[PDB]
């Protein structure tokens, strides 16, 4: 009886079998609906395309994300995401395998209630579990203690955990992640005359942000380098055949993570968020958290983030204690890898939320069982 | 609507029979929006759809209750706290103007 690990993040659904090393099904969480007039009769024209089929046929569809800012807004769309990742991607019946699910910290509880109700009534498993994403990101780092900066597509949160105990008062949350970076890149790509307004153009701008953007080490030196000479310019070929060229906007797009005043957010950067989350803890446990900065999520996949993070934390913290940044290359699927580590354990057999516990306590035992 | 609340209480007590909510004398009115989430075995109809089919078949006099509740749509958007803060600011400004009348010179 192999379990299933299914990270239903804001960015991409990452689902597969427990005990494995890489997830079997990685696909973006969008629901595409047709907006034009259907003229050809027959041939099986569906009213809703879910998953990669919406990405392939995105030139005639309006795309709706069922998860916005880490909170599941639309529920029938999320049921279509769960039905596609159970019946079509993994091609297994969901009622014979236990399922682990991930959840953001500081969540409203009715999200957990409706997730438990949907997984126990629509896709009624014998057993399930809801886990925190930062605990699974720290479990896949080969350790137990440390602080996780988990930055998905909507939520960037710092959670410090000391000796397996997740401190709740030091959890900090900032609503600035890769969708807002994509929208800021759509805002600053119009400065060169390349207008992008549709939802289908957001995937092209997100591909540009994935392939060409990078985190600078110094902002002013790189801005003076791009203003001095045109050596940092890079070209991109659009799917219709047009070629665009960008300069400083490769590094101004992830500069919002370290300067959140660019899109008008009052809170400070993620290094200051990490510093205030560590400084909310005890004074005796800070030296372990200074050397255990573990990063996760697809937003931390830039090839400049670790040096800038180490320089900003070393400028923030006193120099007597060692500053180390942990950046594994498998951090895109580290939540799924930690879920596959936690699901296969023999100590986890007593921590399952069974069908009889749901029948006794309703869909509310997940608040008192989990953290 | 009271006959609908009696009908929902009878059907839901039969559904919750043997559970924690068995023999329920009443339920909260905020739970009425959560009647849609109780799906069937084949997931084609809801508990709301079963109650709408039951009122269409047996008791069709229930169904005129949207016509009686006309001003509920207007009452859903009106805040009592903002009405209290506006009336307190109105009473303060009337008392401020009347004090300015009494402190006005010749």
């Amino acid at each position: 009886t192999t379990a299933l690990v299914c990270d239903n993040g804001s960015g991409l659904v990452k689902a597969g079998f427990a005990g494995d090393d890489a997830p079997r099904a990685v696909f973006p969480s969008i629901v595409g609906r047709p907006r034009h007039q259907g003229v050809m009769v027959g041939m099986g024209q569906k009213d809703s395309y879910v998953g990669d089929e919406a990405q392939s046929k995105r030139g005639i569809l309006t795309l709706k994300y069922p998860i916005e800012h880490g909170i599941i807004t639309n529920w029938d769309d999320m049921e279509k995401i769960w039905h596609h990742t159970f019946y079509n991607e993994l091609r297994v019946a969901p009622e014979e395998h236990p399922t682990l699910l991930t959840e953001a910290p500081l969540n409203p509880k009715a999200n957990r209630e409706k997730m438990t109700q949907i997984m126990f009534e629509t896709f009624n498993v014998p057993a399930m579990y809801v886990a925190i994403q930062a605990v699974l990101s720290l479990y896949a780092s080969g350790r137990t203690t440390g602080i996780v900066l988990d930055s998905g597509d909507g939520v960037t949160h710092n959670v410090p955990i000391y000796e397996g105990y997740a401190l709740p008062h030091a959890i900090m949350r900032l609503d600035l992640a890769g969708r807002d970076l994509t929208d800021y890149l759509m805002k600053i790509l119009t400065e060169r005359g390349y207008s992008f307004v549709t939802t289908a153009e957001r995937e092209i701008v997100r591909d540009i942000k994935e392939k060409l953007c990078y985190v600078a080490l110094d902002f002013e030196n790189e801005m003076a380098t791009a203003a001095s000479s045109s050596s940092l310019e890079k070209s991109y070929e659009l799917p219709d055949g047009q070629v665009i060229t960008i300069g400083n906007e490769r590094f101004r797009c992830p500069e919002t993570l370290f300067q959140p005043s660019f899109i008008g957010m009052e809170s400070a950067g993620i290094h200051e968020t990490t510093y205030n989350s560590i400084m909310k803890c005890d004074i005796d446990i800070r030296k372990d958290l200074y050397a255990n900065n573990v990063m996760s999520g697809g937003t931390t996949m830039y090839p400049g983030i670790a040096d800038r993070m180490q320089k900003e934390i070393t400028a923030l913290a006193p120099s007597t204690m060692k500053i180390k940044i942990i950046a594994p290359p498998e951090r895109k699927y580290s939540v799924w890898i930690g879920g596959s580590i936690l699901a296969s354990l023999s100590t986890f057999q007593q921590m399952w939320i069974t069908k009889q516990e749901y029948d006794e306590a309703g869909p509310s035992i997940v608040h008192r069982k989990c953290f | 609507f009271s006959s609908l609340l009696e009908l929902t209480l009878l059907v839901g007590n039969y559904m919750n029979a043997g559970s924690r909510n068995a023999g329920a004398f009443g339920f909260n009115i905020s739970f009425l929006c959560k009647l849609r989430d109780t799906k069937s075995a084949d997931q084609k109809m809801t508990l709301l759809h079963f109650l709408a089919e039951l009122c269409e078949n047996d008791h069709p006099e229930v169904l005129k209750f949207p016509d009686e509740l006309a001003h509920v749509e207007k009452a859903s958007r009106v805040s009592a706290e903002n009405l209290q803060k506006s009336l307190d600011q109105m009473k303060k400004q009337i008392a401020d103007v009347e004090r300015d009348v009494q402190n006005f010179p010749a």
Binding site: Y139, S141, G142, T144, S344, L345 | -
Partner: peptide, 22 residues
């Protein structure tokens, strides 16, 4: 209605997480 709506411990845990990672 029947036809329609029919239905120590801390060190051993942290070592098991460490052995599951390794």
């Amino acid at each position: 209605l029947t036809l329609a709506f029919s239905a120590d411990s801390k060190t051993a845990q942290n070592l098991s997480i460490f052995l599951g990672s390794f």
